Symmetry: C3
Subunit: 414 residues, 3 copies
């Protein structure tokens, strides 16, 4: 009667548990994750490496007649007939110089490679660095490590290598970071008579902030700083931590992955780009690792440059990379004031044995620091551990029917 | 005795469950949510639309005598007596021109509307665009769609309309995005003799990065780019996904919402602004949708402009919008280098048949691209599903008393 | 037989529960938290305070002979022998002026303090502010509150004090925020003949956006704005809410913490810096709170400046602060256009009784506003409440063995 009518209710009671229990278990097998994000004022924070490059690759005073012979076409300074292009943007003073050293009348070519050319003609930290300070302590060119990029001879502050103990940061604000004044030396910029991957229309420098154990890809990923300004770059360290499979696609950062000791997206790109160029050009560019022969200027112009341009512009499949388990990003906010003021122009001009106008066109101050909330963690966390599933489906089992595994397994037998 | 003394303990055992069980259930009815945030290096990412506008609305060489008659007051070029204001910022060359075409002696007005004025006198992409490249491929003005904003005749790269397959992005870096060089043509800027909503003190352009299916509100939401610089804009696509009620206030993006096919905040504003202006002015501005008559310059000056200024400045209640369920934000980091260098100035001057000084005052290079971590999802997720509640209150029921719904319902009867 | 063989299975059944139950309970005592992040289009949002400072601390026309006597060395205008340094960056017009008022022949020193010097010689809002507008309403210097920083006499828009009802914001875009035009007055910049903590090589202003109830640390934390540009600063209000112990290190914002009514990182720093300077110099700088005597210029030069420089540069332990429970951050994106255009230069020059060149070197427009998604909450939330633990370990207890606290406690006795 009424006892067996709510036995039908039990079927209904049974009916509910099925839908609910099958829910929490399907949910488990989506392997869901959530995010733990903490922006905080840190302490003992490690200062990143700072790489920079003049936008002018070679120094006009350092370009020799042999340099001009081998690489003059690459720099659009000579046509294919080894002579000054008649379509040159003439300068009565400059043109006199170049066509003097474009005179190969008594000249027989001498051995040449791009790395030495870059290393020699590349702008020098010792004459660009007019002032360096980190946290009240002054830096010297000794504090900048030479690194070659697609820009040429570039420099890294706080590279952290050389067993030199990496620098730390405590508070927010300019005084707890780096400040450097630079002369980009527009008077040493090579004439631009045409468009190549080595010449530029812009004056200034390129900068990139990265981990000490992440190589720079400053050509693609860096930011610019204009001369005649003081630029403030306020940063924030963002540590991103991901979950390995089955919760997410994630590569171990101690990656068993070639040219570098650490796996990072940037290193992964450089790896593939090198393989690609070696494979397709029998040639490596000056900034690439390995042991292939460096490209000759002709190889640069005919093979190396478009090979890399293809990879960084058109390629959609050859050199794509996985995500590491740990990524460090640096948020940044830039800001400018003018340099020099009228009040201070004559001072700097005098101080550096330079024209007042020169100071206006070449001088540049760069501040790199962190805000008060200087550190941020973005860690993915598992949302449904197995134990919590059992506690749920268990706590669900007991509700509608009050069963147990013994109750089932024993009654499933006996 | 001791058996009935821990029957009192049972009351205590009962007492606890009440507080704990009533906790997880109140908690459910707050409908709590948490956040799933994933910054990742994507692939096959869709490149956004890029809208830009010269800050000068009309071209001085294209302003005709009829144009001057109808709209000259709006542009502060004529007073109320249809003549040059005696308080004009004279230019012996320019003033000769204007007062020649401000000569209405033999003139009888001719039909006129703002849309045609804008369309005709508005700066032309075909003469501003000195160079365009996207991912190694060159663009043409063909790749830019004309859009009218409050700035006038503006252009959208990758508008995605026209059945033209939208462009994609794979990696981080400049080469995997857009670069354009522009001449803002300061020699065509109209004289500023007064302050109106059509004139500006600034030279440069306004830019805004948005979804192909989000209209631009570049006047309010855009960023500027200065001439005589190369500006790098490093981006990151942020997809924000919200929960519908009861978990959150959220509007379906396939919104049954007027002038546009998609619901977005921006489209919602433009909707209301149009209704407002039509209602209050019997007039729509040139950039607004619908089928009202366009405002005459007099309607612009007397009714249309302050109507819109009120909406975008003072209004606190008339045109407020709901949140869509999906929002796309683009984080961005800007950065500059100077253009041109001394070394390259003569080249560009020669190349574009322009003065060296001109190049310095009008030329501008813009790079728009994404970083390595180019895609971010910020999705709200439900924190306490019903099933997890039951598993909890169930698992709580079994703890203190070991009950079930059968145990209750049956004993609540029998 | 088979009945007692799955009694061994029960030991196994028992064995599992131990590992699983001990899991959810260890997990509880990590006190884990997750994050609830909501970016939203707000309404009735409170507009922040905006502090700004000219980079030139004193006005050359306001520096008197007594001012020069007392503070001339601090400003590197006089050597230690109270005379013009022979190594001065001469200006035939300026040098005539200074050495006239550096003439102490008939001079006997008069009382002097830095606060009055700053207050008097400091740049004046009433002559810097050429135009102010907030949401369609015009501002006056009346709307700017005087605040002293390490820069000197500075000003705060929307300080929110004075019982003046704080301003609100509704939408995204420039029109729903602040715009001001400034003359930085480079013609009043003091000559820079040397390097001190009071002189600068840069022209422009420093700006910082903060809570009305957070003091400014504009020297360390602010951003710059260059003259001869219009800069757009697009903002987003980020409210960060943390958990108190045991879930996290967190200080109550109604902090029983000295010089200010609210606890914030910035106020905490200023507190310690004042104590430090008072303790070590018997002297407080002009911008510091309390009741110590202000530093004399000699105290500034010998004690006060390096004391503070040490704190903001080298210090790693003395003045470190805890995290408040509530923090307000303002994300921002900057952007520039040039001012003036050729078309408008003559206008502004005429309008402000200034040279055309002057306008180019001193004039500056600043827009501060919010984007569409103007408000963001980043709140840490508890991940495992006690009740959810009990529901889990309870629901786990019932699964493997079907026990209860009664079952245990009673059988643990009887
Ligand atoms: Cl690549
Ligand atoms: Cl609106
Ligand atoms: Cl401090």
């Amino acid at each position: 009667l009424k006892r067996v009518v709510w036995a039908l209710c039990f079927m209904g009671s049974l009916a509910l548990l099925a839908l609910v229990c099958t829910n929490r278990i399907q949910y488990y097998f989506l392997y869901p994750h959530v995010t733990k994000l903490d922006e905080v004022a840190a302490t003992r924070l490690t200062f990143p490496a700072v790489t920079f490059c003049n936008l002018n690759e070679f120094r006009f005073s350092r370009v020799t007649k042999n340099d001009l012979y081998h690489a003059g076409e690459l720099l659009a300074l000579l046509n294919n007939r080894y002579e000054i292009p008649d379509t040159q943007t003439a300068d009565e003073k400059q043109l006199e110089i170049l066509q003097d050293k474009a005179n190969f009348r008594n000249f027989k070519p001498k051995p040449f490679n791009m790395l030495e050319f870059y290393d020699r003609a590349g702008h020098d930290i010792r004459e660009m660095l007019l002032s360096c300070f980190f946290r009240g302590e002054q830096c010297s060119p000794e504090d900048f490590k030479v690194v070659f990029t697609r820009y040429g001879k570039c420099y890294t502050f706080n590279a952290g290598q050389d067993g030199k103990p990496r620098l730390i940061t405590m508070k927010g604000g300019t005084g707890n970071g780096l400040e450097i004044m630079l002369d980009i030396q527009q008077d040493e910029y090579l004439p631009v008579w045409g468009e190549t991957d080595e010449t530029s229309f812009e004056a200034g420098i390129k900068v990139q902030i990265h981990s000490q154990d992440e190589p720079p890809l400053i050509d693609q990923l860096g930011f610019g700083v204009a001369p005649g300004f003081q630029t403030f770059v306020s940063c924030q360290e963002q540590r991103l931590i991901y979950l390995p499979p089955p919760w997410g696609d994630c590569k171990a950062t101690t990656g068993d992955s070639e040219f570098y000791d650490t796996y990072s997206i940037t290193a992964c790109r450089i790896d593939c780009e090198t393989r690609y160029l070696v494979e397709n050009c029998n040639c490596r560019m000056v900034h690439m690792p390995g042991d292939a022969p460096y490209c000759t200027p002709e190889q640069y112009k005919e093979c190396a440059d478009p090979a890399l341009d293809f990879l960084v512009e058109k390629d959609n499949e050859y050199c794509v990379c996985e995500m590491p388990c740990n990524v460090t990003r640096y948020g940044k906010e830039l800001s400018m004031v003018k340099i020099p003021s009228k009040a201070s122009a004559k001072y700097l001009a005098k101080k550096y044995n330079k024209s007042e106008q020169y100071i206006g066109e070449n001088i540049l101050v760069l501040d790199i620091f962190f805000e008060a909330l200087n550190y941020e963690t973005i860690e993915q966390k598992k949302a449904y551990e197995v134990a919590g599933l059992l506690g749920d489906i268990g706590g669900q089992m007991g509700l509608f029917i009050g069963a147990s595994i013994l109750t089932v397994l024993e009654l499933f037998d006996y």
